[PDB]
Amino acid sequence: MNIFEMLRIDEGLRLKIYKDTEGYYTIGIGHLLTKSPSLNAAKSELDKAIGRNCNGVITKDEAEKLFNQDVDAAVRGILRNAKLKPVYDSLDAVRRCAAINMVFQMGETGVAGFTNSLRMLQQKRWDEAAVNLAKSRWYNQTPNRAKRVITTFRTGTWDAYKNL
Numbered sequence: 001m002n003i004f005e006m007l008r009i010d011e012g013l014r015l016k017i018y019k020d021t022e023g024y025y026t027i028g029i030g031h032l033l034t035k036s037p038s039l040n041a042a043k044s045e046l047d048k049a050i051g052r053n054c055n056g057v058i059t060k061d062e063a064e065k066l067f068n069q070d071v072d073a074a075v076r077g078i079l080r081n082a083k084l085k086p087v088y089d090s091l092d093a094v095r096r097c098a099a100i101n102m103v104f105q106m107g108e109t110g111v112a113g114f115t116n117s118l119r120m121l122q123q124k125r126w127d128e129a130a131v132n133l134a135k136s137r138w139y140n141q142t143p144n145r146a147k148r149v150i151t152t153f154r155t156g157t158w159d160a161y162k163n164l
């Protein structure tokens, strides 16, 4: 298991524009195109992202390229964020994947809300962190994914993903 396999399980793979769990136009392996209600706006973003006229459809290779870029961007975002970097640097390799997973899903605008979770993770209080992380819109709206990510933080193992 690695971050690519983990996120591929959590995000799936679809080659045509679809709506994500929040109703937003998305493609590939959880590549958000726009939060605009306009499908035309989403198609413009897709064509810009891929560099050709896609008419709402991409290849698997194109999906995997966007995914590589998106994982890289999630990691760089963590490294650039004064609140996230010290916590990330304190984690082992498996838990670092859980961190990247959350940033990939939610971005960074809600980082302050996770202040207490971050402190518990830095303190290596894994069970307490797991309890705190579940007290969230994130957990309530995507509970199965959140449970997998939280189990990964709690245990530092891939147990929640193995079967998958």
Ligand SMILES: CCCCCCc1ccccc1
Pocket: 078, 084, 085, 087, 088, 098, 099, 100, 102, 103, 106, 107, 108, 110, 111, 114, 117, 118, 121
């Ligand atoms: C969406 C913010 C989640 C913060 C807690 C998990 C995490 C993410 C990134 C680096 C360290 C910890």
